[PDB]
Amino acid sequence: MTPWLLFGAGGVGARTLELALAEQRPVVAVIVQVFCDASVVAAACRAAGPDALIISTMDYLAHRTVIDEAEKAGITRMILVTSLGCGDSWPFLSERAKAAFGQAVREKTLAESWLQTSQLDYAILRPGGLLDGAATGKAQRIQNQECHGFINRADVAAHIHELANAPALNQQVYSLIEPDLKP
């Protein structure tokens, strides 16, 4: 059982904490061993062990610290959860969404590029609108495609888990929606 080090697990991160607990997996969290503050972040990277998987579900500053402290501390694998609208999915966000979430999606886009130019084995997850229903199992990982939709926080957790069990993350970026789920 590989350690998970969670950031922003107070949401998707909390649901991810649950799966880990329901599995008896050792978990470190910055908020199970609970610890932007480089001292805190450096500390937690030591506790997790260099074999930990980082799972981030958290602005730009917090992420860069995490990415940077991960690499100093010998961790080599990270799952970053941002949002549809980030990076190259930006042109598919409606003008109305840009005006409402723009600042947030833009900071998280900074985080993506930092991680994409790091040496971590990474996966990036771009969930649609987050709903708080119980996990269906119906959410899809989508690449190279225009997506619009919602997804339960618990399904993002389930996809995080599936990615975690993979032999490598492979620097992949995915949209995560459940087509046909309505809020």
Side-chain angles (χ1 to χ4, degrees), residues 1-23 25-32 34-45 47-58 60 62-102 104-183:
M1 290 271 105
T2 301
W4 290 3
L5 167 54
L6 290 304
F7 287 92
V12 164
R15 301 243 57 169
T16 298
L17 237 180
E18 293 170 25
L19 273 198
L21 289 186
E23 246 208 334
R25 184 184 301 275
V27 254
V28 187
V30 168
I31 290 292
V32 14
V34 184
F35 280 70
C36 197
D37 189 334
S39 286
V40 183
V41 177
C45 289
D51 275 309
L53 164 68
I54 281 171
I55 302 156
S56 199
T57 60
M58 291 187 272
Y60 152 67
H63 287 93
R64 187 225 188 95
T65 306
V66 166
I67 300 167
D68 286 346
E69 292 316 311
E71 294 183 316
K72 249 113 76 169
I75 288 150
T76 63
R77 19 202 305 283
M78 176 168 317
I79 292 171
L80 175 58
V81 176
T82 59
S83 159
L84 270 187
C86 285
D88 54 10
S89 61
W90 179 268
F92 295 135
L93 223 55
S94 68
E95 294 312 295
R96 188 171 174 270
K98 282 174 189 168
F101 306 115
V105 169
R106 295 210 279 163
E107 295 285 313
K108 293 185 160 171
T109 298
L110 298 168
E112 292 187 350
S113 50
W114 199 252
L115 174 65
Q116 274 170 302
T117 56
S118 71
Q119 286 85 55
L120 304 172
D121 185 35
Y122 69 79
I124 294 172
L125 301 172
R126 296 180 172 157
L130 290 178
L131 302 185
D132 257 290
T136 81
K138 290 197 192 176
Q140 297 173 12
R141 270 187 302 266
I142 304 165
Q143 283 174 317
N144 302 312
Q145 173 170 331
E146 186 186 2
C147 295
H148 302 294
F150 293 91
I151 186 174
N152 290 310
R153 306 194 202 249
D155 278 280
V156 182
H159 276 264
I160 283 161
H161 182 286
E162 219 262 323
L163 254 12
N165 277 355
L169 297 165
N170 289 324
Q171 298 180 324
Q172 300 306 303
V173 185
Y174 319 87
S175 294
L176 265 186
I177 58 162
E178 185 187 330
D180 326 341
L181 176 78
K182 313 306 166 164

PDB file of all heavy atoms in Angstrom, residues 82-95 97-98 105-106 108-109 112 116 124-128 142-148 173-177:
ATOM      1  N   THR A  82      -7.239  19.973 -11.331  1.00  0.00           N
ATOM      2  CA  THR A  82      -7.604  21.367 -11.567  1.00  0.00           C
ATOM      3  C   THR A  82      -9.066  21.448 -11.951  1.00  0.00           C
ATOM      4  O   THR A  82      -9.947  21.249 -11.112  1.00  0.00           O
ATOM      5  CB  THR A  82      -6.733  22.064 -12.629  1.00  0.00           C
ATOM      6  OG1 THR A  82      -6.832  21.372 -13.882  1.00  0.00           O
ATOM      7  CG2 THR A  82      -5.279  22.123 -12.176  1.00  0.00           C
ATOM      8  N   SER A  83      -9.329  21.702 -13.223  1.00  0.00           N
ATOM      9  CA  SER A  83     -10.688  21.992 -13.656  1.00  0.00           C
ATOM     10  C   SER A  83     -10.735  22.113 -15.178  1.00  0.00           C
ATOM     11  O   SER A  83      -9.767  22.565 -15.789  1.00  0.00           O
ATOM     12  CB  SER A  83     -11.133  23.306 -13.001  1.00  0.00           C
ATOM     13  OG  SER A  83     -12.203  23.895 -13.702  1.00  0.00           O
ATOM     14  N   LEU A  84     -11.844  21.696 -15.791  1.00  0.00           N
ATOM     15  CA  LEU A  84     -12.140  22.084 -17.178  1.00  0.00           C
ATOM     16  C   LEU A  84     -12.022  23.600 -17.314  1.00  0.00           C
ATOM     17  O   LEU A  84     -12.431  24.351 -16.429  1.00  0.00           O
ATOM     18  CB  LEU A  84     -13.559  21.687 -17.574  1.00  0.00           C
ATOM     19  CG  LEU A  84     -13.816  20.317 -18.190  1.00  0.00           C
ATOM     20  CD1 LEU A  84     -15.276  20.240 -18.663  1.00  0.00           C
ATOM     21  CD2 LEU A  84     -12.857  20.050 -19.349  1.00  0.00           C
ATOM     22  N   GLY A  85     -11.481  24.060 -18.430  1.00  0.00           N
ATOM     23  CA  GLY A  85     -11.243  25.481 -18.592  1.00  0.00           C
ATOM     24  C   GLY A  85      -9.772  25.786 -18.514  1.00  0.00           C
ATOM     25  O   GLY A  85      -9.313  26.761 -19.066  1.00  0.00           O
ATOM     26  N   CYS A  86      -9.029  24.936 -17.824  1.00  0.00           N
ATOM     27  CA  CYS A  86      -7.596  25.139 -17.627  1.00  0.00           C
ATOM     28  C   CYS A  86      -6.804  24.775 -18.868  1.00  0.00           C
ATOM     29  O   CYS A  86      -7.253  23.966 -19.676  1.00  0.00           O
ATOM     30  CB  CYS A  86      -7.083  24.284 -16.457  1.00  0.00           C
ATOM     31  SG  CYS A  86      -7.522  24.912 -14.860  1.00  0.00           S
ATOM     32  N   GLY A  87      -5.616  25.357 -18.988  1.00  0.00           N
ATOM     33  CA  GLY A  87      -4.735  25.081 -20.111  1.00  0.00           C
ATOM     34  C   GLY A  87      -5.431  25.209 -21.457  1.00  0.00           C
ATOM     35  O   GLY A  87      -6.092  26.207 -21.758  1.00  0.00           O
ATOM     36  N   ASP A  88      -5.302  24.174 -22.268  1.00  0.00           N
ATOM     37  CA  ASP A  88      -5.827  24.225 -23.623  1.00  0.00           C
ATOM     38  C   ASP A  88      -7.317  23.945 -23.721  1.00  0.00           C
ATOM     39  O   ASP A  88      -7.863  23.892 -24.810  1.00  0.00           O
ATOM     40  CB  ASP A  88      -5.033  23.300 -24.560  1.00  0.00           C
ATOM     41  CG  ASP A  88      -4.934  21.866 -24.059  1.00  0.00           C
ATOM     42  OD1 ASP A  88      -5.621  21.490 -23.087  1.00  0.00           O
ATOM     43  OD2 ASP A  88      -4.162  21.095 -24.671  1.00  0.00           O
ATOM     44  N   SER A  89      -7.976  23.758 -22.585  1.00  0.00           N
ATOM     45  CA  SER A  89      -9.431  23.637 -22.586  1.00  0.00           C
ATOM     46  C   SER A  89     -10.075  25.009 -22.406  1.00  0.00           C
ATOM     47  O   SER A  89     -11.294  25.148 -22.549  1.00  0.00           O
ATOM     48  CB  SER A  89      -9.922  22.653 -21.518  1.00  0.00           C
ATOM     49  OG  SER A  89      -9.551  23.071 -20.221  1.00  0.00           O
ATOM     50  N   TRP A  90      -9.246  26.014 -22.104  1.00  0.00           N
ATOM     51  CA  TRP A  90      -9.686  27.420 -22.022  1.00  0.00           C
ATOM     52  C   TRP A  90     -10.606  27.940 -23.167  1.00  0.00           C
ATOM     53  O   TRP A  90     -11.650  28.514 -22.885  1.00  0.00           O
ATOM     54  CB  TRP A  90      -8.495  28.356 -21.785  1.00  0.00           C
ATOM     55  CG  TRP A  90      -8.849  29.828 -21.707  1.00  0.00           C
ATOM     56  CD1 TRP A  90      -8.864  30.713 -22.736  1.00  0.00           C
ATOM     57  CD2 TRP A  90      -9.219  30.576 -20.534  1.00  0.00           C
ATOM     58  NE1 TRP A  90      -9.223  31.955 -22.290  1.00  0.00           N
ATOM     59  CE2 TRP A  90      -9.447  31.901 -20.942  1.00  0.00           C
ATOM     60  CE3 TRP A  90      -9.384  30.249 -19.184  1.00  0.00           C
ATOM     61  CZ2 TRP A  90      -9.828  32.902 -20.057  1.00  0.00           C
ATOM     62  CZ3 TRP A  90      -9.760  31.244 -18.307  1.00  0.00           C
ATOM     63  CH2 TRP A  90      -9.972  32.556 -18.745  1.00  0.00           C
ATOM     64  N   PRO A  91     -10.247  27.711 -24.448  1.00  0.00           N
ATOM     65  CA  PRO A  91     -11.130  28.237 -25.498  1.00  0.00           C
ATOM     66  C   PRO A  91     -12.517  27.601 -25.510  1.00  0.00           C
ATOM     67  O   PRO A  91     -13.353  28.025 -26.300  1.00  0.00           O
ATOM     68  CB  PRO A  91     -10.415  27.842 -26.792  1.00  0.00           C
ATOM     69  CG  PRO A  91      -9.004  27.562 -26.403  1.00  0.00           C
ATOM     70  CD  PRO A  91      -9.108  26.974 -25.031  1.00  0.00           C
ATOM     71  N   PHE A  92     -12.761  26.599 -24.674  1.00  0.00           N
ATOM     72  CA  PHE A  92     -14.048  25.928 -24.687  1.00  0.00           C
ATOM     73  C   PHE A  92     -14.931  26.377 -23.524  1.00  0.00           C
ATOM     74  O   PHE A  92     -16.107  26.041 -23.467  1.00  0.00           O
ATOM     75  CB  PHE A  92     -13.872  24.403 -24.696  1.00  0.00           C
ATOM     76  CG  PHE A  92     -13.224  23.876 -25.953  1.00  0.00           C
ATOM     77  CD1 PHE A  92     -12.214  22.929 -25.890  1.00  0.00           C
ATOM     78  CD2 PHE A  92     -13.616  24.337 -27.199  1.00  0.00           C
ATOM     79  CE1 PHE A  92     -11.617  22.453 -27.055  1.00  0.00           C
ATOM     80  CE2 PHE A  92     -13.014  23.866 -28.350  1.00  0.00           C
ATOM     81  CZ  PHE A  92     -12.020  22.926 -28.278  1.00  0.00           C
ATOM     82  N   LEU A  93     -14.353  27.143 -22.607  1.00  0.00           N
ATOM     83  CA  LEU A  93     -15.098  27.756 -21.512  1.00  0.00           C
ATOM     84  C   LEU A  93     -15.986  28.882 -22.067  1.00  0.00           C
ATOM     85  O   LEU A  93     -15.519  29.657 -22.911  1.00  0.00           O
ATOM     86  CB  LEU A  93     -14.098  28.335 -20.518  1.00  0.00           C
ATOM     87  CG  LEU A  93     -14.384  28.112 -19.045  1.00  0.00           C
ATOM     88  CD1 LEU A  93     -14.538  26.640 -18.780  1.00  0.00           C
ATOM     89  CD2 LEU A  93     -13.256  28.705 -18.221  1.00  0.00           C
ATOM     90  N   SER A  94     -17.244  28.994 -21.636  1.00  0.00           N
ATOM     91  CA  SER A  94     -18.078  30.108 -22.123  1.00  0.00           C
ATOM     92  C   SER A  94     -17.575  31.429 -21.553  1.00  0.00           C
ATOM     93  O   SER A  94     -17.001  31.448 -20.467  1.00  0.00           O
ATOM     94  CB  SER A  94     -19.546  29.930 -21.748  1.00  0.00           C
ATOM     95  OG  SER A  94     -19.730  30.050 -20.343  1.00  0.00           O
ATOM     96  N   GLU A  95     -17.784  32.521 -22.285  1.00  0.00           N
ATOM     97  CA  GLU A  95     -17.457  33.876 -21.804  1.00  0.00           C
ATOM     98  C   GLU A  95     -17.985  34.133 -20.385  1.00  0.00           C
ATOM     99  O   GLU A  95     -17.341  34.810 -19.564  1.00  0.00           O
ATOM    100  CB  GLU A  95     -18.023  34.945 -22.752  1.00  0.00           C
ATOM    101  CG  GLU A  95     -17.404  34.955 -24.142  1.00  0.00           C
ATOM    102  CD  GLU A  95     -15.903  34.914 -24.088  1.00  0.00           C
ATOM    103  OE1 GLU A  95     -15.312  35.886 -23.589  1.00  0.00           O
ATOM    104  OE2 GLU A  95     -15.303  33.900 -24.507  1.00  0.00           O
ATOM    105  N   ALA A  97     -18.517  31.841 -18.088  1.00  0.00           N
ATOM    106  CA  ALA A  97     -17.654  31.076 -17.185  1.00  0.00           C
ATOM    107  C   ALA A  97     -16.287  31.737 -16.966  1.00  0.00           C
ATOM    108  O   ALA A  97     -15.759  31.737 -15.854  1.00  0.00           O
ATOM    109  CB  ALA A  97     -17.484  29.670 -17.686  1.00  0.00           C
ATOM    110  N   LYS A  98     -15.716  32.290 -18.030  1.00  0.00           N
ATOM    111  CA  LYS A  98     -14.469  33.042 -17.912  1.00  0.00           C
ATOM    112  C   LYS A  98     -14.598  34.220 -16.925  1.00  0.00           C
ATOM    113  O   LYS A  98     -13.744  34.419 -16.079  1.00  0.00           O
ATOM    114  CB  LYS A  98     -14.012  33.546 -19.280  1.00  0.00           C
ATOM    115  CG  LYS A  98     -13.354  32.495 -20.149  1.00  0.00           C
ATOM    116  CD  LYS A  98     -13.097  33.076 -21.506  1.00  0.00           C
ATOM    117  CE  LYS A  98     -12.639  32.022 -22.492  1.00  0.00           C
ATOM    118  NZ  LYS A  98     -12.680  32.580 -23.868  1.00  0.00           N
ATOM    119  N   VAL A 105      -9.465  29.583 -12.604  1.00  0.00           N
ATOM    120  CA  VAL A 105      -8.987  28.714 -13.668  1.00  0.00           C
ATOM    121  C   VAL A 105      -7.612  29.149 -14.189  1.00  0.00           C
ATOM    122  O   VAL A 105      -6.768  28.310 -14.505  1.00  0.00           O
ATOM    123  CB  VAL A 105      -9.999  28.631 -14.812  1.00  0.00           C
ATOM    124  CG1 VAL A 105      -9.398  27.959 -16.040  1.00  0.00           C
ATOM    125  CG2 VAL A 105     -11.251  27.901 -14.352  1.00  0.00           C
ATOM    126  N   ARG A 106      -7.367  30.453 -14.240  1.00  0.00           N
ATOM    127  CA  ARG A 106      -6.058  30.927 -14.661  1.00  0.00           C
ATOM    128  C   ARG A 106      -4.893  30.617 -13.698  1.00  0.00           C
ATOM    129  O   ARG A 106      -3.812  30.257 -14.158  1.00  0.00           O
ATOM    130  CB  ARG A 106      -6.108  32.403 -15.018  1.00  0.00           C
ATOM    131  CG  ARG A 106      -6.967  32.692 -16.209  1.00  0.00           C
ATOM    132  CD  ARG A 106      -6.443  33.887 -16.942  1.00  0.00           C
ATOM    133  NE  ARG A 106      -6.799  35.163 -16.395  1.00  0.00           N
ATOM    134  CZ  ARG A 106      -6.179  36.289 -16.712  1.00  0.00           C
ATOM    135  NH1 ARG A 106      -5.151  36.276 -17.557  1.00  0.00           N
ATOM    136  NH2 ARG A 106      -6.588  37.420 -16.165  1.00  0.00           N
ATOM    137  N   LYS A 108      -4.885  28.081 -11.642  1.00  0.00           N
ATOM    138  CA  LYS A 108      -4.716  26.632 -11.757  1.00  0.00           C
ATOM    139  C   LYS A 108      -4.030  26.222 -13.057  1.00  0.00           C
ATOM    140  O   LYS A 108      -3.380  25.172 -13.130  1.00  0.00           O
ATOM    141  CB  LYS A 108      -6.060  25.920 -11.606  1.00  0.00           C
ATOM    142  CG  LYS A 108      -6.629  26.060 -10.232  1.00  0.00           C
ATOM    143  CD  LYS A 108      -7.889  25.254 -10.096  1.00  0.00           C
ATOM    144  CE  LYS A 108      -8.188  25.004  -8.633  1.00  0.00           C
ATOM    145  NZ  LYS A 108      -9.540  24.397  -8.444  1.00  0.00           N
ATOM    146  N   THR A 109      -4.178  27.050 -14.082  1.00  0.00           N
ATOM    147  CA  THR A 109      -3.430  26.859 -15.314  1.00  0.00           C
ATOM    148  C   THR A 109      -1.919  27.103 -15.084  1.00  0.00           C
ATOM    149  O   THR A 109      -1.082  26.411 -15.646  1.00  0.00           O
ATOM    150  CB  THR A 109      -3.995  27.737 -16.458  1.00  0.00           C
ATOM    151  OG1 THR A 109      -5.348  27.352 -16.717  1.00  0.00           O
ATOM    152  CG2 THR A 109      -3.194  27.552 -17.720  1.00  0.00           C
ATOM    153  N   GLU A 112      -0.634  23.948 -13.553  1.00  0.00           N
ATOM    154  CA  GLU A 112      -0.475  22.902 -14.563  1.00  0.00           C
ATOM    155  C   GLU A 112       0.831  23.040 -15.324  1.00  0.00           C
ATOM    156  O   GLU A 112       1.526  22.043 -15.578  1.00  0.00           O
ATOM    157  CB  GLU A 112      -1.630  22.887 -15.581  1.00  0.00           C
ATOM    158  CG  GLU A 112      -2.992  22.479 -15.057  1.00  0.00           C
ATOM    159  CD  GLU A 112      -4.012  22.342 -16.183  1.00  0.00           C
ATOM    160  OE1 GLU A 112      -3.697  22.738 -17.322  1.00  0.00           O
ATOM    161  OE2 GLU A 112      -5.129  21.833 -15.942  1.00  0.00           O
ATOM    162  N   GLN A 116       3.892  20.559 -15.525  1.00  0.00           N
ATOM    163  CA  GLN A 116       4.193  20.007 -16.838  1.00  0.00           C
ATOM    164  C   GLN A 116       5.652  20.226 -17.262  1.00  0.00           C
ATOM    165  O   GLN A 116       6.166  19.538 -18.153  1.00  0.00           O
ATOM    166  CB  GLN A 116       3.258  20.586 -17.882  1.00  0.00           C
ATOM    167  CG  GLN A 116       1.970  19.848 -17.983  1.00  0.00           C
ATOM    168  CD  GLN A 116       0.985  20.566 -18.837  1.00  0.00           C
ATOM    169  OE1 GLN A 116       0.639  21.709 -18.555  1.00  0.00           O
ATOM    170  NE2 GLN A 116       0.537  19.922 -19.902  1.00  0.00           N
ATOM    171  N   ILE A 124      -2.817  15.057 -14.875  1.00  0.00           N
ATOM    172  CA  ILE A 124      -3.654  16.209 -14.581  1.00  0.00           C
ATOM    173  C   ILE A 124      -5.117  15.850 -14.868  1.00  0.00           C
ATOM    174  O   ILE A 124      -5.441  15.364 -15.970  1.00  0.00           O
ATOM    175  CB  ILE A 124      -3.194  17.488 -15.356  1.00  0.00           C
ATOM    176  CG1 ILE A 124      -1.816  17.935 -14.857  1.00  0.00           C
ATOM    177  CG2 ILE A 124      -4.161  18.627 -15.134  1.00  0.00           C
ATOM    178  CD1 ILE A 124      -1.177  19.051 -15.647  1.00  0.00           C
ATOM    179  N   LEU A 125      -5.983  16.054 -13.865  1.00  0.00           N
ATOM    180  CA  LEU A 125      -7.438  15.851 -14.010  1.00  0.00           C
ATOM    181  C   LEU A 125      -8.231  17.166 -14.055  1.00  0.00           C
ATOM    182  O   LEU A 125      -8.128  18.027 -13.160  1.00  0.00           O
ATOM    183  CB  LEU A 125      -8.005  14.968 -12.889  1.00  0.00           C
ATOM    184  CG  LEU A 125      -7.449  13.557 -12.727  1.00  0.00           C
ATOM    185  CD1 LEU A 125      -8.004  12.931 -11.440  1.00  0.00           C
ATOM    186  CD2 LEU A 125      -7.754  12.700 -13.953  1.00  0.00           C
ATOM    187  N   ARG A 126      -9.036  17.310 -15.093  1.00  0.00           N
ATOM    188  CA  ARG A 126      -9.834  18.518 -15.285  1.00  0.00           C
ATOM    189  C   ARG A 126     -11.314  18.190 -15.166  1.00  0.00           C
ATOM    190  O   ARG A 126     -11.962  17.924 -16.161  1.00  0.00           O
ATOM    191  CB  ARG A 126      -9.559  19.121 -16.674  1.00  0.00           C
ATOM    192  CG  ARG A 126      -8.128  19.602 -16.869  1.00  0.00           C
ATOM    193  CD  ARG A 126      -7.942  20.184 -18.243  1.00  0.00           C
ATOM    194  NE  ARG A 126      -6.642  20.827 -18.398  1.00  0.00           N
ATOM    195  CZ  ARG A 126      -6.057  21.011 -19.575  1.00  0.00           C
ATOM    196  NH1 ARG A 126      -6.663  20.589 -20.680  1.00  0.00           N
ATOM    197  NH2 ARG A 126      -4.875  21.607 -19.654  1.00  0.00           N
ATOM    198  N   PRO A 127     -11.842  18.183 -13.944  1.00  0.00           N
ATOM    199  CA  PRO A 127     -13.248  17.839 -13.700  1.00  0.00           C
ATOM    200  C   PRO A 127     -14.151  18.915 -14.265  1.00  0.00           C
ATOM    201  O   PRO A 127     -13.720  20.063 -14.370  1.00  0.00           O
ATOM    202  CB  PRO A 127     -13.368  17.880 -12.177  1.00  0.00           C
ATOM    203  CG  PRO A 127     -11.991  17.896 -11.664  1.00  0.00           C
ATOM    204  CD  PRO A 127     -11.130  18.528 -12.705  1.00  0.00           C
ATOM    205  N   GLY A 128     -15.374  18.553 -14.635  1.00  0.00           N
ATOM    206  CA  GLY A 128     -16.383  19.550 -14.944  1.00  0.00           C
ATOM    207  C   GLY A 128     -16.955  20.127 -13.657  1.00  0.00           C
ATOM    208  O   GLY A 128     -16.305  20.078 -12.619  1.00  0.00           O
ATOM    209  N   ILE A 142     -11.431  11.768 -20.559  1.00  0.00           N
ATOM    210  CA  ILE A 142     -11.479  12.152 -21.948  1.00  0.00           C
ATOM    211  C   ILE A 142     -10.225  12.928 -22.317  1.00  0.00           C
ATOM    212  O   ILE A 142      -9.798  13.820 -21.577  1.00  0.00           O
ATOM    213  CB  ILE A 142     -12.735  12.999 -22.222  1.00  0.00           C
ATOM    214  CG1 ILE A 142     -13.981  12.220 -21.785  1.00  0.00           C
ATOM    215  CG2 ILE A 142     -12.820  13.370 -23.691  1.00  0.00           C
ATOM    216  CD1 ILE A 142     -15.231  13.051 -21.668  1.00  0.00           C
ATOM    217  N   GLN A 143      -9.628  12.591 -23.457  1.00  0.00           N
ATOM    218  CA  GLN A 143      -8.508  13.386 -23.971  1.00  0.00           C
ATOM    219  C   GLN A 143      -8.785  13.961 -25.355  1.00  0.00           C
ATOM    220  O   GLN A 143      -9.567  13.401 -26.110  1.00  0.00           O
ATOM    221  CB  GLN A 143      -7.225  12.565 -23.985  1.00  0.00           C
ATOM    222  CG  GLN A 143      -6.610  12.420 -22.628  1.00  0.00           C
ATOM    223  CD  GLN A 143      -5.424  11.479 -22.615  1.00  0.00           C
ATOM    224  OE1 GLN A 143      -5.453  10.416 -23.230  1.00  0.00           O
ATOM    225  NE2 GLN A 143      -4.370  11.869 -21.907  1.00  0.00           N
ATOM    226  N   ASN A 144      -8.144  15.086 -25.665  1.00  0.00           N
ATOM    227  CA  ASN A 144      -8.149  15.656 -27.019  1.00  0.00           C
ATOM    228  C   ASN A 144      -9.553  15.949 -27.531  1.00  0.00           C
ATOM    229  O   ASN A 144      -9.846  15.781 -28.716  1.00  0.00           O
ATOM    230  CB  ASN A 144      -7.455  14.714 -28.018  1.00  0.00           C
ATOM    231  CG  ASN A 144      -6.025  14.392 -27.636  1.00  0.00           C
ATOM    232  OD1 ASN A 144      -5.232  15.284 -27.315  1.00  0.00           O
ATOM    233  ND2 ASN A 144      -5.685  13.102 -27.666  1.00  0.00           N
ATOM    234  N   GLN A 145     -10.434  16.374 -26.643  1.00  0.00           N
ATOM    235  CA  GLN A 145     -11.816  16.511 -27.027  1.00  0.00           C
ATOM    236  C   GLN A 145     -12.480  17.598 -26.217  1.00  0.00           C
ATOM    237  O   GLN A 145     -12.182  17.765 -25.042  1.00  0.00           O
ATOM    238  CB  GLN A 145     -12.517  15.180 -26.809  1.00  0.00           C
ATOM    239  CG  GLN A 145     -14.006  15.210 -26.999  1.00  0.00           C
ATOM    240  CD  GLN A 145     -14.570  13.821 -26.992  1.00  0.00           C
ATOM    241  OE1 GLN A 145     -13.878  12.873 -27.368  1.00  0.00           O
ATOM    242  NE2 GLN A 145     -15.817  13.675 -26.538  1.00  0.00           N
ATOM    243  N   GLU A 146     -13.364  18.346 -26.866  1.00  0.00           N
ATOM    244  CA  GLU A 146     -14.214  19.328 -26.208  1.00  0.00           C
ATOM    245  C   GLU A 146     -15.195  18.641 -25.251  1.00  0.00           C
ATOM    246  O   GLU A 146     -15.980  17.796 -25.670  1.00  0.00           O
ATOM    247  CB  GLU A 146     -15.002  20.111 -27.266  1.00  0.00           C
ATOM    248  CG  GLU A 146     -15.824  21.258 -26.699  1.00  0.00           C
ATOM    249  CD  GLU A 146     -16.696  21.928 -27.739  1.00  0.00           C
ATOM    250  OE1 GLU A 146     -16.691  21.477 -28.902  1.00  0.00           O
ATOM    251  OE2 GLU A 146     -17.390  22.905 -27.396  1.00  0.00           O
ATOM    252  N   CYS A 147     -15.140  19.003 -23.971  1.00  0.00           N
ATOM    253  CA  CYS A 147     -16.070  18.476 -22.974  1.00  0.00           C
ATOM    254  C   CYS A 147     -16.818  19.567 -22.262  1.00  0.00           C
ATOM    255  O   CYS A 147     -16.276  20.634 -21.999  1.00  0.00           O
ATOM    256  CB  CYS A 147     -15.333  17.673 -21.903  1.00  0.00           C
ATOM    257  SG  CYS A 147     -14.591  16.232 -22.563  1.00  0.00           S
ATOM    258  N   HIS A 148     -18.053  19.263 -21.904  1.00  0.00           N
ATOM    259  CA  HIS A 148     -18.838  20.115 -21.044  1.00  0.00           C
ATOM    260  C   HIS A 148     -19.698  19.210 -20.183  1.00  0.00           C
ATOM    261  O   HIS A 148     -20.416  18.359 -20.701  1.00  0.00           O
ATOM    262  CB  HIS A 148     -19.744  21.024 -21.881  1.00  0.00           C
ATOM    263  CG  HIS A 148     -18.999  21.890 -22.839  1.00  0.00           C
ATOM    264  ND1 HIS A 148     -18.154  22.897 -22.423  1.00  0.00           N
ATOM    265  CD2 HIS A 148     -18.963  21.900 -24.193  1.00  0.00           C
ATOM    266  CE1 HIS A 148     -17.624  23.487 -23.477  1.00  0.00           C
ATOM    267  NE2 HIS A 148     -18.105  22.906 -24.566  1.00  0.00           N
ATOM    268  N   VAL A 173      -2.979  14.359 -19.366  1.00  0.00           N
ATOM    269  CA  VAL A 173      -3.988  15.323 -18.953  1.00  0.00           C
ATOM    270  C   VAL A 173      -5.356  14.833 -19.393  1.00  0.00           C
ATOM    271  O   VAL A 173      -5.535  14.446 -20.549  1.00  0.00           O
ATOM    272  CB  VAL A 173      -3.743  16.682 -19.601  1.00  0.00           C
ATOM    273  CG1 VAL A 173      -4.732  17.720 -19.058  1.00  0.00           C
ATOM    274  CG2 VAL A 173      -2.305  17.127 -19.367  1.00  0.00           C
ATOM    275  N   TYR A 174      -6.318  14.822 -18.477  1.00  0.00           N
ATOM    276  CA  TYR A 174      -7.677  14.383 -18.820  1.00  0.00           C
ATOM    277  C   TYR A 174      -8.776  15.346 -18.357  1.00  0.00           C
ATOM    278  O   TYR A 174      -8.703  15.906 -17.258  1.00  0.00           O
ATOM    279  CB  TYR A 174      -8.011  13.031 -18.199  1.00  0.00           C
ATOM    280  CG  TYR A 174      -6.938  11.973 -18.201  1.00  0.00           C
ATOM    281  CD1 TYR A 174      -6.015  11.898 -17.176  1.00  0.00           C
ATOM    282  CD2 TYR A 174      -6.899  11.001 -19.188  1.00  0.00           C
ATOM    283  CE1 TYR A 174      -5.052  10.908 -17.147  1.00  0.00           C
ATOM    284  CE2 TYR A 174      -5.952  10.012 -19.170  1.00  0.00           C
ATOM    285  CZ  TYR A 174      -5.028   9.964 -18.144  1.00  0.00           C
ATOM    286  OH  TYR A 174      -4.065   8.972 -18.124  1.00  0.00           O
ATOM    287  N   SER A 175      -9.796  15.517 -19.201  1.00  0.00           N
ATOM    288  CA  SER A 175     -11.084  16.040 -18.774  1.00  0.00           C
ATOM    289  C   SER A 175     -11.828  14.914 -18.085  1.00  0.00           C
ATOM    290  O   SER A 175     -11.694  13.765 -18.462  1.00  0.00           O
ATOM    291  CB  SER A 175     -11.900  16.492 -19.970  1.00  0.00           C
ATOM    292  OG  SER A 175     -11.311  17.600 -20.602  1.00  0.00           O
ATOM    293  N   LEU A 176     -12.605  15.249 -17.071  1.00  0.00           N
ATOM    294  CA  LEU A 176     -13.376  14.272 -16.322  1.00  0.00           C
ATOM    295  C   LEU A 176     -14.802  14.755 -16.225  1.00  0.00           C
ATOM    296  O   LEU A 176     -15.097  15.694 -15.482  1.00  0.00           O
ATOM    297  CB  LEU A 176     -12.826  14.145 -14.913  1.00  0.00           C
ATOM    298  CG  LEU A 176     -11.830  13.034 -14.667  1.00  0.00           C
ATOM    299  CD1 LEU A 176     -11.502  12.973 -13.183  1.00  0.00           C
ATOM    300  CD2 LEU A 176     -12.427  11.736 -15.157  1.00  0.00           C
ATOM    301  N   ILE A 177     -15.680  14.132 -16.997  1.00  0.00           N
ATOM    302  CA  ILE A 177     -17.107  14.405 -16.903  1.00  0.00           C
ATOM    303  C   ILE A 177     -17.902  13.105 -16.877  1.00  0.00           C
ATOM    304  O   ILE A 177     -17.444  12.057 -17.346  1.00  0.00           O
ATOM    305  CB  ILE A 177     -17.631  15.275 -18.087  1.00  0.00           C
ATOM    306  CG1 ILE A 177     -17.355  14.586 -19.420  1.00  0.00           C
ATOM    307  CG2 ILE A 177     -17.010  16.670 -18.072  1.00  0.00           C
ATOM    308  CD1 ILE A 177     -18.203  15.119 -20.589  1.00  0.00           C
TER     309      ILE A 177
END
